[PDB]
Design a protein around this ligand. Structure first.
Ligand code: 3ED
Length: 490
């Protein structure tokens, strides 16, 4: 769609003078605080003045002050441009940004013998990249590879705040120049067409060389994460069944809803309950062989539906990464019985066989059966992580890594076990960090230390199945630290 209203490298003062000079009433934009990560601002001009609106994300959701909670900054703006629930404030005209730092083809300061190096070794027909001019003062050079082969270089000028290739149109930003020639490829005089199929991959690395990449990104991480965050715009899938009136009080958060293409559909429902097929949960498929279900912390009215999912999907392990109450607010109601006790959750029956307390988690062996038939009893192993902080992320990955290693071996011991149910508060942040780590680790086991891993490609592949998997840069960097830690221990 768009998402050009997000300006990554502007301050509070600059956002005003932009909206005050190059905008009108209804203009808006989002920006991160360069100072402290996790904080974002929504600058909207109304009645000749600008109105800044703070957005906080500690690792679970984007909390709009005086508003609601959303999964992505795209779904936030999309919800308000098509509504009014923001008091009123109007999001009419998005003030686009020209800074190409978050573009996946722009590689900033990059020389020519390095550019040909990556294009020849890792490129294919259509690979391209934009870089600052290594010859000139402040211009840019486009490099395109075509074949199965050659590498054509196209010089881009900067003439009075406009970019051009030495003839034709003068574009206001590098993106408009790139996006134009991805729509109208430059054709050389001898038939060679400069096709811009896909940007050059630079994030795909061998699993062995993981420490050196973490060494580079720490000089890096913020630039690559926001580059991935800019691609959240192509993930605005439908959430109809979640927005239905009958399902409004089944979501822990009003506007954190499951995608309609991967939502878990509750079958075998009550014929007297008019609507009993919905639950805030999504199917998670890797390389999209171990599957997942990213769901939310159970409300008091969703416990029966939650257990219906664990039964209908033949799940055997539940990974919970939140305390029942954090920061004084409710994150998840106790959906399991007390130890040595037996409870009925509608049509499902659950017995707490034994509870085992470790350093960083509690293990609850549970007995799940359906009321009626005698042979439906199955063992469900709940791994309730407790040492995850309310803010930020764990500083050392060794804690969560031992956690996932015990969860993996339990899943491997069970025959035809269903998908692993993971959930935190909203079931997108901490839950997403687990699944991505468990997905990347699961690759290292089968292929070894010498294999390809693509942290952003995996996260993007998971976000296309549930809104906003992995929330903050902290979780993004933590995943890198988690993968790196797993490989140093070999
Ligand atoms: C996350 C990511 N970062 C890429 N770069 C790193 C950063 C630069 C550009 C190159 C280079 O310096 C910076 C100015 C930035 N401009 C390239 C890239 O392809 N991904 C990606 C991978 C898989 C799935 C998705 Cl959705 C995405 Cl976005």
């Amino acid at each position: 769609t768009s998402r050009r209203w997000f300006h990554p490298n502007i301050t509070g003062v600059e956002a005003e003078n932009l909206l005050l000079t190059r905008g009108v009433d209804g203009s808006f934009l989002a920006r991160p605080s360069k100072s402290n990560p996790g904080d974002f601002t929504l600058s909207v001009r109304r009645n000749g003045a600008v109105t800044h609106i703070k957005i906080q994300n500690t690792g679970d959701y984007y909390d709009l002050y005086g508003g609601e909670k959303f999964a992505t900054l795209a779904e936030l703006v999309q919800y308000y441009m098509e509504h009014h629930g923001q008091l009123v404030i109007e999001l009419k005209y998005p003030l686009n940004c020209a800074d190409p730092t978050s573009e996946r083809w722009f590689h900033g300061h990059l020389s020519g013998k390095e550019a040909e190096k990556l294009l020849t070794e890792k490129g294919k027909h259509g690979s391209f990249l934009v870089r600052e001019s290594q010859s000139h003062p402040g211009d840019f050079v486009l490099s395109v590879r075509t074949g199965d082969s050659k590498v054509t270089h196209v010089m881009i000028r900067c003439q009075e705040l406009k970019y051009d290739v030495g003839g034709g149109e003068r574009f206001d930003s590098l993106t408009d120049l790139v996006e134009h020639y991805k729509k109208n490829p430059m054709v050389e005089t001898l038939g060679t067409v400069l096709q811009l199929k896909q940007p050059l991959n630079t994030t795909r690395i061998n699993a062995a060389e993981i420490e050196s990449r973490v060494r580079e990104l720490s000089k890096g991480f913020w630039e690559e994460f926001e580059t991935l965050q800019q691609q959240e715009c192509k993930l605005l899938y439908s959430r109809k069944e979640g927005q239905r009136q009958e399902n409004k009080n089944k979501n822990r958060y009003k506007n954190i809803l499951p995608f309609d293409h991967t939502r878990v559909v509750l079958h075998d429902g009550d014929p007297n309950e008019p609507v009993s097929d919905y639950i805030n949960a999504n199917i998670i498929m890797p390389e999209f062989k171990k599957s997942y279900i990213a769901t939310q912390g159970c409300l008091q009215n969703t416990v029966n539906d939650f257990w219906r999912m664990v039964f209908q999907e033949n799940s055997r392990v539940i990974v919970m990464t939140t305390k029942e109450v954090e920061r004084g607010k409710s994150k998840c109601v106790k959906y399991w019985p007390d130890e040595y006790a037996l409870k009925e959750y509608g049509v499902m029956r659950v017995r707490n066989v034994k509870e085992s307390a470790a350093h960083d988690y509690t293990l609850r062996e549970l007995k799940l059966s359906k009321v009626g038939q005698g042979n439906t009893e199955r063992t469900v192993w709940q791994y309730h992580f407790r040492t995850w902080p309310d803010h930020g992320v764990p500083s050392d990955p060794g804690g969560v890594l031992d956690f996932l290693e015990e969860v993996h071996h339990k899943q491997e011991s069970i025959m035809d076990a269903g998908p692993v149910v993971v959930h935190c508060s909203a079931g997108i942040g901490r839950t997403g960090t687990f699944i991505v780590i468990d997905i990347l680790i699961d690759i290292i086991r089968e292929k070894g230390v010498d294999c390809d891993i693509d942290v952003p490609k995996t996260i993007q592949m998971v976000r296309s199945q549930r809104s906003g998997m992995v929330q903050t840069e902290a979780q993004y960097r933590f995943i890198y630290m988690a993968v790196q830690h797993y490989i140093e221990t070999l």
